[PDB]
Amino acid sequence: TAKKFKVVTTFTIIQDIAQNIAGDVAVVESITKPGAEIHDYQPTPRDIVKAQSADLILWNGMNLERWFEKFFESIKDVPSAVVTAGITPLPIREGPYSGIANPHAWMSPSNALIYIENIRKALVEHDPAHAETYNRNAQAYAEKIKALDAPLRERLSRIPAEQRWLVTSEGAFSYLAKDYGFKEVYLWPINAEQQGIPQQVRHVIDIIRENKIPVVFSESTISDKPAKQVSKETGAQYGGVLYVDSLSGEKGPVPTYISLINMTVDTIAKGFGQ
């Protein structure tokens, strides 16, 4: 066991999934730090160094990392792999990114099985000496992710179907909402320029009052202020922060992809009174 295979991912969710497949034969590091905004991140010369010293670079695609393709052009002789191949996208409904794929495919545990398989195939292709370890690790981790779905689905099914409105800041939850039958309301369709402008807040407030939706949420890499404004002006409580674009630090409450899915579903469920 000389030097371990080095994998660099764009952001922390892919880092944790890939590290579960890598196990002990590869080290996986994320370009973006926990808590950093991932959509419009601005890479630095130190990020170039980190990616250039990798043996393999993984990214989400589906219009997540607006910085990645310009960034990757600076990188020489390092293979890359998009980990969303074979996932059917949901389009963004409105705004300047309307009609392109929503990037947040990982919030569906079913979709995470495809992430796992894409990451497995890339590691097997570019580090074939350890294919047996990657294959075995991916099979074990897929087993965990697959069993994750039933308790979550049952938990959210307790909410009456007609009351299943998921009101968040970024429209980051479309794939989770589809899986578990939530209608989707958000202050902005995808992180970008305009986030909490008027008209946006206005429309969400009207839908809240119309349907007496009991709770609204923010997310961990953006400002909580628009969501707290919406809850102050309406009958909805501020349900807290959901995790979607970033894990927490390793000593934080959301250190892993599994903990992110569980925490986000628990917070939603608690926002509705379990």
Ligand SMILES: [Mn+2]
């Ligand atoms: Mn996002």
